[PDB]
Coordinates of C-alpha atoms (C1' of nucleotides) in Angstrom, one line a residue:
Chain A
X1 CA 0.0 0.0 0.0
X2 CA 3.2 2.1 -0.2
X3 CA 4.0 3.9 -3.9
X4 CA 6.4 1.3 -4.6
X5 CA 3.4 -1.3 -4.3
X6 CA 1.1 0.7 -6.8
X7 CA 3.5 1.2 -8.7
X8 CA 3.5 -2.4 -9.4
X9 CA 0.0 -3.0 -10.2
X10 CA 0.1 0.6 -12.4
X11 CA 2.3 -0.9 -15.2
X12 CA -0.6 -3.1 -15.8
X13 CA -2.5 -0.4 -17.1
X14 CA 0.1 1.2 -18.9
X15 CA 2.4 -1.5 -20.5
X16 CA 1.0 -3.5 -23.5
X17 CA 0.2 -7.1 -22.9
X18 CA 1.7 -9.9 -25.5
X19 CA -1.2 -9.9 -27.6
X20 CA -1.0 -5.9 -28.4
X21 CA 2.8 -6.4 -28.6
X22 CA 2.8 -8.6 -31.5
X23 CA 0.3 -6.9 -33.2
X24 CA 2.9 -4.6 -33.3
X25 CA 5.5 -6.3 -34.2
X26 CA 3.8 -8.5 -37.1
X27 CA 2.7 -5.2 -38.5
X28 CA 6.3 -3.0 -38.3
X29 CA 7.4 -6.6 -39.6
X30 CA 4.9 -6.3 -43.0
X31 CA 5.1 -3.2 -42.9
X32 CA 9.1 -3.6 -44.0
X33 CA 8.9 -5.6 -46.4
X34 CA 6.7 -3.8 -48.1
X35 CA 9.0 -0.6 -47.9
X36 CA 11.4 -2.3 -49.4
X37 CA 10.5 -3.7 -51.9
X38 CA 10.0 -0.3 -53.4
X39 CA 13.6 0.1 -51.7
X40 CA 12.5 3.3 -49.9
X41 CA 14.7 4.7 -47.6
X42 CA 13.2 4.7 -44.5
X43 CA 13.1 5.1 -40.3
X44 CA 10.5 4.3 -38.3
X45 CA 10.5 6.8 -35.1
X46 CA 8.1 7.7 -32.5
X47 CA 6.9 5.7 -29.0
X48 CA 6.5 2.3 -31.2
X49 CA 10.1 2.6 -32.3
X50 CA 11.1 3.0 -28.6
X51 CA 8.5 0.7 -26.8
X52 CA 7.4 3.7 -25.1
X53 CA 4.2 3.9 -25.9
X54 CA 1.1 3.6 -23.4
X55 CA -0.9 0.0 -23.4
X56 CA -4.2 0.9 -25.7
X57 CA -1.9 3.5 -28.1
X58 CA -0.6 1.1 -30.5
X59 CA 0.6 3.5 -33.8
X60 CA 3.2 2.9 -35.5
X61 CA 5.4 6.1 -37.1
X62 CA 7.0 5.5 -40.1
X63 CA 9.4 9.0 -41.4
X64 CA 10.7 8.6 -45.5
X65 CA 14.1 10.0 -45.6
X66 CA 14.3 12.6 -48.7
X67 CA 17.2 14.4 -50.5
X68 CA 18.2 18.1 -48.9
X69 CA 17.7 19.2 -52.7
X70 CA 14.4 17.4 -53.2
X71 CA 11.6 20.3 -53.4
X72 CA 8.5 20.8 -51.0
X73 CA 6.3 19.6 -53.6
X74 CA 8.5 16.5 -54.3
X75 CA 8.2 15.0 -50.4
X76 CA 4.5 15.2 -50.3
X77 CA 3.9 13.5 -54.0
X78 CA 6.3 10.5 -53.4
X79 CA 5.6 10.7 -50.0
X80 CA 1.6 10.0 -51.3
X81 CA 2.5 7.7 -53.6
X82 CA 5.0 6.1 -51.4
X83 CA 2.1 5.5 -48.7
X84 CA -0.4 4.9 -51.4
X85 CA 1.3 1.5 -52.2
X86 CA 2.2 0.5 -49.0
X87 CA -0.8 0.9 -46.9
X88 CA -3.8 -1.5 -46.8
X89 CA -6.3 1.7 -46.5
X90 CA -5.1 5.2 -46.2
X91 CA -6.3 8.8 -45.8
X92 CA -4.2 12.2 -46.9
X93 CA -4.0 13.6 -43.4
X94 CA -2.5 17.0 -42.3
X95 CA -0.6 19.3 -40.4
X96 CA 2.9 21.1 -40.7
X97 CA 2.6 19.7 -44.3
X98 CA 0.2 16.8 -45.5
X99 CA 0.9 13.6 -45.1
X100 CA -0.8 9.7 -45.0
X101 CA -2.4 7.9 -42.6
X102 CA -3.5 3.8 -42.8
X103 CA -3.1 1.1 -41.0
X104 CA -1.7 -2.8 -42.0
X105 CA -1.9 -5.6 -40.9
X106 CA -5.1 -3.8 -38.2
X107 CA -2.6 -1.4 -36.7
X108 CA -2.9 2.7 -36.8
X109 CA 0.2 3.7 -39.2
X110 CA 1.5 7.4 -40.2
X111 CA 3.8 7.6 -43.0
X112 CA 5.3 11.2 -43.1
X113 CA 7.9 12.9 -45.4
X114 CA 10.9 14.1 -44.2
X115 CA 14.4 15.8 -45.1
X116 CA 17.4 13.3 -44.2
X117 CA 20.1 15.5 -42.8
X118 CA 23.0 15.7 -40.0
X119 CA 23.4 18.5 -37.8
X120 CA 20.2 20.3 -36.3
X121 CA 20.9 23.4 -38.4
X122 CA 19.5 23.0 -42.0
X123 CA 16.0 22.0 -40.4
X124 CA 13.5 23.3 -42.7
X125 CA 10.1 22.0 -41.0
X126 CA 9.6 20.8 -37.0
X127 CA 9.0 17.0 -39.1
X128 CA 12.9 16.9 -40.0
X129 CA 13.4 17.6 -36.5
X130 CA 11.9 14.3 -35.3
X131 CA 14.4 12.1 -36.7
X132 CA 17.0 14.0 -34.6
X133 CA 14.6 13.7 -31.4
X134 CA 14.4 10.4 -31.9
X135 CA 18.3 9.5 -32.5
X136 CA 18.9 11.5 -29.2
X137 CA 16.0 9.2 -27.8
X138 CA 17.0 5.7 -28.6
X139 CA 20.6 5.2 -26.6
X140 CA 19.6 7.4 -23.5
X141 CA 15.6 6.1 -23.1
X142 CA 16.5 2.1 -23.4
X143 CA 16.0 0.2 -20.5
X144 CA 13.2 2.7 -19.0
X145 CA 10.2 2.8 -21.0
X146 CA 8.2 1.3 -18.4
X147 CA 8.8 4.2 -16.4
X148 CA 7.8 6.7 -19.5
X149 CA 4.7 4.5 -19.7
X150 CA 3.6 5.2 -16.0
X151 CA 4.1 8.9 -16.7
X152 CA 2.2 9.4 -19.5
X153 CA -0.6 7.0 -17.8
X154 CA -0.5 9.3 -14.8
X155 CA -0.7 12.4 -17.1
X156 CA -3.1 10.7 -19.3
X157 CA -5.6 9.7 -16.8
X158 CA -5.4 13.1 -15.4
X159 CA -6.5 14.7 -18.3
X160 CA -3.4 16.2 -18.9
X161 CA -1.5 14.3 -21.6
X162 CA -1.2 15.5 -25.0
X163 CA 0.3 18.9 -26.8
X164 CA -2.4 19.8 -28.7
X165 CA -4.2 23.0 -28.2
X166 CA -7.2 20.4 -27.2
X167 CA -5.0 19.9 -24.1
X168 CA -2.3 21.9 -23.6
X169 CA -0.4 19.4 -21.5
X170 CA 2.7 17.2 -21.6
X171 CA 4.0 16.0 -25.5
X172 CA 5.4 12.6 -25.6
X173 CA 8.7 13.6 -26.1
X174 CA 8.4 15.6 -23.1
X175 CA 7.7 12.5 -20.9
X176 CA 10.8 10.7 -22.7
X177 CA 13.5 13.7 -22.0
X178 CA 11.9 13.7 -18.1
X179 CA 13.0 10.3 -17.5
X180 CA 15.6 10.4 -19.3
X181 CA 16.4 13.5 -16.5
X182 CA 15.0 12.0 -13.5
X183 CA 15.7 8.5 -13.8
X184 CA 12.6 7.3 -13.3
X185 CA 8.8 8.2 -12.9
X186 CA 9.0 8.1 -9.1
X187 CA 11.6 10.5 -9.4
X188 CA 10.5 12.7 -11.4
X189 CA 7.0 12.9 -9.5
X190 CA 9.2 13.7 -6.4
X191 CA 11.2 16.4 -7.9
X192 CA 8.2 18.0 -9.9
X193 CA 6.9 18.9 -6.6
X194 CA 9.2 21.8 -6.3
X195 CA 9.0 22.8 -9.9
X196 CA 7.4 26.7 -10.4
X197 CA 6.5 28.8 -12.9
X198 CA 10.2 30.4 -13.5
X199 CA 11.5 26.7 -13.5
X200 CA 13.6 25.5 -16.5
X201 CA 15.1 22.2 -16.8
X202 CA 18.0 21.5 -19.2
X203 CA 18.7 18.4 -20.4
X204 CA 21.6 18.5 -22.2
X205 CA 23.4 20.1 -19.9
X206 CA 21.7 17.9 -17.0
X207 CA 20.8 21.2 -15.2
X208 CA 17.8 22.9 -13.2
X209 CA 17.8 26.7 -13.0
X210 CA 15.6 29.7 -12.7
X211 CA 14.0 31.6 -15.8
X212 CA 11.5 33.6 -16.7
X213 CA 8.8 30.7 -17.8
X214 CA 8.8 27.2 -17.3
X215 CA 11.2 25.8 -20.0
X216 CA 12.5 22.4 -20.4
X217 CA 15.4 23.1 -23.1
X218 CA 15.2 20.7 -26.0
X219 CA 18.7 18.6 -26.3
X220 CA 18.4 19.0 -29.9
X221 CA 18.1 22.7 -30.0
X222 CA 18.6 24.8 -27.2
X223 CA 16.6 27.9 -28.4
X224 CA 13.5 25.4 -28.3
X225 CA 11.0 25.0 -25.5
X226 CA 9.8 21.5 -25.8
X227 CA 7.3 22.2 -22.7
X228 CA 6.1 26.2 -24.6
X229 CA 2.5 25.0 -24.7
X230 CA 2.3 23.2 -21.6
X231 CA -0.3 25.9 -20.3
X232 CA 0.6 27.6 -16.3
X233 CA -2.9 26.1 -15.2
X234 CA -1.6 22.6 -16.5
X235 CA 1.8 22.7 -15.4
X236 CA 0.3 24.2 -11.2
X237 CA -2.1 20.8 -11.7
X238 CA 0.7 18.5 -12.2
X239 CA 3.1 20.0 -9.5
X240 CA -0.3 19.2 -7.2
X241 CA -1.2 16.0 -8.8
X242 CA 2.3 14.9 -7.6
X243 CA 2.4 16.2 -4.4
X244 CA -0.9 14.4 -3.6
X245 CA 0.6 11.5 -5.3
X246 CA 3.4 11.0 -2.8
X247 CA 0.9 12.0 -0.1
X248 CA -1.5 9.1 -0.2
X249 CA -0.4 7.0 -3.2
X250 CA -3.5 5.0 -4.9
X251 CA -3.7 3.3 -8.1
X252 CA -6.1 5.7 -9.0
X253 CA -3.9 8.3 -10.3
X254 CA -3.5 6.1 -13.1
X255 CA -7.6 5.7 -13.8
X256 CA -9.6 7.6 -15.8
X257 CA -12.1 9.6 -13.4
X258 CA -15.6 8.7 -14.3
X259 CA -17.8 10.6 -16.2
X260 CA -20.1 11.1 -13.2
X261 CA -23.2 12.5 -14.9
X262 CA -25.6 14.7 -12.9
X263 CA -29.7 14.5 -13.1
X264 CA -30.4 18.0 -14.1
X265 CA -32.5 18.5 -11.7
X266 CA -29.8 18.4 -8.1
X267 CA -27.9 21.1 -11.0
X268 CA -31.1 23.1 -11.0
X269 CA -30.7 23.2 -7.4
X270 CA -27.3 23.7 -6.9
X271 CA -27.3 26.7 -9.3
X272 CA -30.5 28.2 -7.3
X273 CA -28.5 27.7 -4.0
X274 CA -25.7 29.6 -5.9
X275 CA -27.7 32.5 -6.6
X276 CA -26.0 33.4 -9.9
X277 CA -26.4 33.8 -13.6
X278 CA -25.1 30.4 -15.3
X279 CA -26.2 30.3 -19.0
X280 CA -24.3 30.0 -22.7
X281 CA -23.7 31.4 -26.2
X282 CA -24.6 28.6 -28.1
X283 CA -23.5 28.4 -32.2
X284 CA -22.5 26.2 -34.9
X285 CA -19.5 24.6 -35.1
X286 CA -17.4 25.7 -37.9
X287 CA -15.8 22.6 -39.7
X288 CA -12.3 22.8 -38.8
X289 CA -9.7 21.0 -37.0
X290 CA -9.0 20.8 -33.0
X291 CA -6.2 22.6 -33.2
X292 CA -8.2 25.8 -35.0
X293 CA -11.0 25.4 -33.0
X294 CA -10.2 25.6 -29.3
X295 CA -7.4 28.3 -29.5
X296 CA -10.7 30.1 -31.1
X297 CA -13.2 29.2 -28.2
X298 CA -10.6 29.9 -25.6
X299 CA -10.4 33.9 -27.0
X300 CA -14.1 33.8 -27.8
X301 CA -14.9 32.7 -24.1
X302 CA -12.1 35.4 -23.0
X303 CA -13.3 38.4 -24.8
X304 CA -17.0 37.9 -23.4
X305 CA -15.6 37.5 -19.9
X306 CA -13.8 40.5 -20.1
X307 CA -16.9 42.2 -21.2
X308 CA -19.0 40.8 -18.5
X309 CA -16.7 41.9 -16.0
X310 CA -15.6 45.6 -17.0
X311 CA -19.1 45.7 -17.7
X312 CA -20.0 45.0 -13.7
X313 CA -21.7 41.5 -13.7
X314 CA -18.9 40.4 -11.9
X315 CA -18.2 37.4 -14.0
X316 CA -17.0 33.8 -11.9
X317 CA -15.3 31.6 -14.3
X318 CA -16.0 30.7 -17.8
X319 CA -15.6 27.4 -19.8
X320 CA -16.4 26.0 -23.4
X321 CA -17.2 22.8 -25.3
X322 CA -17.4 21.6 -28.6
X323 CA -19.8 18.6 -30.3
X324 CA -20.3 17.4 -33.5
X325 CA -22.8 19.8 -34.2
X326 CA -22.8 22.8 -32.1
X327 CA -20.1 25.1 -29.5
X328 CA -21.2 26.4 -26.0
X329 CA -19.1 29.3 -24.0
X330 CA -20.4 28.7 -20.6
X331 CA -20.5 31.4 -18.2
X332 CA -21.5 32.5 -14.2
X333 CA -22.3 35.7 -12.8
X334 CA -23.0 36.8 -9.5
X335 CA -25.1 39.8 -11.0
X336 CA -28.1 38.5 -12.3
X337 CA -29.4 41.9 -12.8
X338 CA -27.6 45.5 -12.3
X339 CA -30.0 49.2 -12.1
X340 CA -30.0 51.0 -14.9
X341 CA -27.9 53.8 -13.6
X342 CA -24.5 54.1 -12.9
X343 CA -22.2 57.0 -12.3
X344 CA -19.6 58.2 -14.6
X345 CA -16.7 59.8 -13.2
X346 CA -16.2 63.9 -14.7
X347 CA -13.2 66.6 -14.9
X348 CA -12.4 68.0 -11.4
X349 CA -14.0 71.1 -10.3
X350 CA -11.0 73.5 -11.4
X351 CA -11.1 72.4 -15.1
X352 CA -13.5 75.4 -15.8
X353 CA -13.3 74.1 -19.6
X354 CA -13.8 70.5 -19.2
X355 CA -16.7 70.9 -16.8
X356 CA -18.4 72.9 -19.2
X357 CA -17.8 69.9 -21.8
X358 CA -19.1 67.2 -19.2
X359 CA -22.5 69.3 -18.5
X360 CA -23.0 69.8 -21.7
X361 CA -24.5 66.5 -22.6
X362 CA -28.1 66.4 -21.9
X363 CA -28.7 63.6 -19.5
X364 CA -31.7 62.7 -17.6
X365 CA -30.4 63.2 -13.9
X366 CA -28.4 66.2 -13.4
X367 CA -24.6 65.7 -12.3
X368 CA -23.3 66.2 -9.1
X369 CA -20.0 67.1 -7.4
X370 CA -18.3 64.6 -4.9
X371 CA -14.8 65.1 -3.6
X372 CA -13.5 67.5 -5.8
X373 CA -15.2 66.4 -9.4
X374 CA -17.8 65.8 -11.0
X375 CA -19.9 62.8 -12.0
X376 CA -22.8 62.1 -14.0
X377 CA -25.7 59.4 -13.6
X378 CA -26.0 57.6 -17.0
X379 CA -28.2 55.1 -18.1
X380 CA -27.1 51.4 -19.3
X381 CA -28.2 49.6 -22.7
X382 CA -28.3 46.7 -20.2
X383 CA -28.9 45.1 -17.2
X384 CA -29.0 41.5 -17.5
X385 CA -25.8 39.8 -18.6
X386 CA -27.5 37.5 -21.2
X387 CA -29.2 41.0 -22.5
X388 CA -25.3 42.5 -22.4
X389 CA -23.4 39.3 -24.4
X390 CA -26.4 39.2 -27.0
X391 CA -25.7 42.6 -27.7
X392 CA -21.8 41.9 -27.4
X393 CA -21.9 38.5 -29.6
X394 CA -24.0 40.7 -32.2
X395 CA -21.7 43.3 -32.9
X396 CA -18.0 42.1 -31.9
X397 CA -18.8 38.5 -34.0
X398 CA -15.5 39.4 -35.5
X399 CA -13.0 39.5 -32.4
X400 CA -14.1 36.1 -31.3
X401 CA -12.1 34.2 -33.4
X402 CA -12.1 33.9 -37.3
X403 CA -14.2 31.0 -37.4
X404 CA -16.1 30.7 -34.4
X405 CA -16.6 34.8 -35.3
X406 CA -18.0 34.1 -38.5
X407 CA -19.8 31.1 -37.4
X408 CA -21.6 33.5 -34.5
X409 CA -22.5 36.0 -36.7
X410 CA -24.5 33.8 -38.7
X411 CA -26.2 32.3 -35.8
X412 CA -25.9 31.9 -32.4
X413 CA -28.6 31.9 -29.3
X414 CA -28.3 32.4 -25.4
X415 CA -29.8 29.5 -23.2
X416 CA -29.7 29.5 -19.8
X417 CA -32.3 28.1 -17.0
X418 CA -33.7 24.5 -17.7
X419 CA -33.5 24.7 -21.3
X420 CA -29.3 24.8 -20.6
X421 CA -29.6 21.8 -17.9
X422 CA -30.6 19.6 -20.9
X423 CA -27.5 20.9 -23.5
X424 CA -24.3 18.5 -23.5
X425 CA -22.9 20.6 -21.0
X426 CA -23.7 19.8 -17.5
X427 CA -20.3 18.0 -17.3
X428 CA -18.2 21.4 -18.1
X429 CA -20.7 23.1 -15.7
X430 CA -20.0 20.8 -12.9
X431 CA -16.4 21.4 -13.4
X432 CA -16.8 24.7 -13.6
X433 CA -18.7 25.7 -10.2
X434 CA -17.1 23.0 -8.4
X435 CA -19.8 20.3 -7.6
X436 CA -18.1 17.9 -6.3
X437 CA -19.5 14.5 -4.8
Chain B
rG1 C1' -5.8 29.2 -36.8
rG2 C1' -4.0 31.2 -31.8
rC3 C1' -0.5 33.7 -28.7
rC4 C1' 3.8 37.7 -27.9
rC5 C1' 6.0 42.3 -29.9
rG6 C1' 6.3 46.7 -33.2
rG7 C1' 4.6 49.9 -37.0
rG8 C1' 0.6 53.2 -40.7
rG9 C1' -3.6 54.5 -41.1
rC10 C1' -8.9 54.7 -39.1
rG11 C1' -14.2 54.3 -36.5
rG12 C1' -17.0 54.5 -32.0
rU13 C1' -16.9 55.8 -26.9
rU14 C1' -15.3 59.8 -23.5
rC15 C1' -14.7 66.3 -20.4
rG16 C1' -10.4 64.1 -22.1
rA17 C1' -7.7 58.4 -25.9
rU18 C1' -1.4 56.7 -28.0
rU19 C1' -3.3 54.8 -23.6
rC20 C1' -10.7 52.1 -23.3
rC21 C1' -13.9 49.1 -27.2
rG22 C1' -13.1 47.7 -32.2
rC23 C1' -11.6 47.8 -37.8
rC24 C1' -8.5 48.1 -42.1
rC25 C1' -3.7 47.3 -44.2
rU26 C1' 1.3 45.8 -42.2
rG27 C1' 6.8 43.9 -40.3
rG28 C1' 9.1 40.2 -36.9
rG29 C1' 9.1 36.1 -33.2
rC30 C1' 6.5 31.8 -31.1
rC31 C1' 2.9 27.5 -30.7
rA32 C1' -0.2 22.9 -32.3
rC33 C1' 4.8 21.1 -35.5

RNA sequence: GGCCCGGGGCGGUUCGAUUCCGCCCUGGGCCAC
């Protein structure tokens, strides 16, 4: 019942069992032949490459060598072609620059284009930089990938796994150049416990120092921030994750928390015994990738907050989710209704010139003097904060985002009260106020 | 697509805006890569 113990029964749900293995194997082992039998040249990287990949995540990364003189264009046609003929089924996929996707022999397989090279320098796109990641990779990482298994489980079932923008957590390469540090996953869970927001770990130079952001210095290129979008909320969860961890270690860091759904109705309640306004823009989604589409909801959610609070509702927190079909920016108030007036603050009394300015303007209560200046009592547009974002959303479409921007201005509602209880997004607002139980 | 930084125009708002709220062009860096 000691870490040591868990840790034990932990690599069950992170290491692959025999059956996935060989799946693996049989398929990297097709999956050469093939290759060369068009003689391609040829490197297969990544966590299958390195057994460091997490039980359940079977992929296997396969990164065609090309000529430095080759053009752009040249990669991603032979490149096509190259994973055309290879691959049971396949799909163009994207990113830095298109690529395929397929699998053989039943297993997930990415065949991407790449400049061969030596030396760092030269690097025309982050893809040529993988083969160097991984060369670094292979010597140093052998012999520990069970412990880079139970780290990205840990992360993983803590919802903080992943680089993407979906995410904003800890890349895969990350994990690998932590161990790689630390030793091991126990160690590095002890050490991240002192780890702050001006922390930077160096790798290559097996150092720890201050800095002004949390930086863990790539050993390939030391100008590159392999942690830059691990986000400050992520990184403060993880530091705490761990420090809980070693606290009362349980095997249920390394299980995914339960949906826990919620009958609408003990919501209704909770959000009447909070007092507040809870309710959400909802839109259509606009058909484009993850990686577009929550940087987008993250600034649309942020430019309505900032509204709502220099505005005076008094906004709490704010969240957002995404479906198939439609977007919802969640939001709580603690002013469910403001008066209609409010006081503007005027020139002080000496300004002879602007005082004359400020009483100028015709307004419907007569301006006073406190303190020294003037002020005014002025009338809102307002006073409801779904009556203020419907008249925000309507005319400031275009600062949420490009698509989610457009997307609003062609449509978009406010729901709030029972009609939001039964939206898919009772889970972000449990999250969000802090149910708990 | 988003984020940081810096320019040239603008609009609305305000007694007063470089400085609030926004929009055109526009140069550089970063991120998912």
């Amino acid at each position: 019942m000691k870490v040591e113990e868990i840790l034990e029964k932990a690599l069950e749900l992170v290491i692959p069992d025999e059956e996935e293995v060989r799946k693996g194997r049989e398929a990297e082992e097709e999956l050469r032949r093939r290759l060369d039998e068009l003689g391609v040249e040829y490197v297969f990287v990544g966590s299958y490459a390195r057994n460091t990949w997490l039980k359940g995540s079977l992929e296997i990364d396969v990164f065609l060598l090309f000529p430095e003189e080759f053009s752009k264009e040249e990669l991603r046609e032979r490149g096509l072609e190259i994973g055309k003929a290879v691959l049971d089924s396949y799909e163009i996929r994207y990113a830095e620059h298109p690529y395929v996707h397929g699998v053989v022999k039943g297993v997930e397989v990415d065949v991407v284009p790449c400049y061969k090279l030596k030396e760092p320098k030269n690097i025309k796109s982050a893809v040529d930089r993988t083969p160097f990641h991984h060369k670094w990779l292979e010597g140093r990482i052998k012999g520990k990938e069970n412990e880079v298994r139970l780290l990205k489980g840990f992360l993983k079932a803590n919802g903080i796994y992943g680089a993407e923008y979906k995410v904003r957590g800890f890349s895969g390469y990350l994990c690998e150049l932590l161990i790689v540090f630390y030793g091991s996953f126990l160690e590095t869970v002890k050490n991240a416990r002192r780890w702050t927001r001006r922390t930077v770990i160096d790798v290559a130079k097996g150092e720890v120092r201050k800095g002004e952001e949390f930086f863990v210095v790539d050993p390939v290129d030391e100008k590159r921030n392999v942690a830059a979008n691990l986000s400050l909320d992520n990184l403060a969860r993880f530091v705490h994750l761990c420090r809980e961890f070693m606290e009362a270690p349980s095997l249920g860091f390394f299980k995914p928390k339960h949906p826990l759904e919620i009958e609408p109705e003990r919501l209704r309640k909770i959000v009447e015994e909070r007092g507040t306004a809870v309710f959400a823009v909802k839109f259509r989604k606009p058909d484009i990738v993850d990686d577009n589409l929550y940087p987008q909801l993250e600034r649309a959610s942020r430019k309505i907050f900032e509204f709502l609070e220099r505005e005076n509702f008094m906004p709490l927190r704010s969240a957002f989710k995404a479906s198939e079909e439609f977007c919802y920016l969640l939001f709580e108030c603690q002013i469910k209704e403001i008066s209609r007036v409010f006081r503007r603050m005027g020139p002080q009394f000496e300004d002879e010139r602007n005082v004359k300015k400020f009483l100028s303007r015709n307004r419907a209560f007569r301006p006073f003097i406190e303190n020294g200046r003037w002020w005014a009592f002025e009338m809102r547009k307002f006073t409801t904060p779904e009556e203020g974002v419907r008249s925000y959303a309507s005319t400031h479409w275009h600062t949420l985002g490009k698509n989610v921007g457009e997307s609003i201005r062609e449509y978009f509602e406010i729901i709030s009260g029972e009609k939001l209880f039964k939206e898919p997004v009772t889970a972000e607002l449990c999250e969000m106020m802090g149910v708990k139980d």
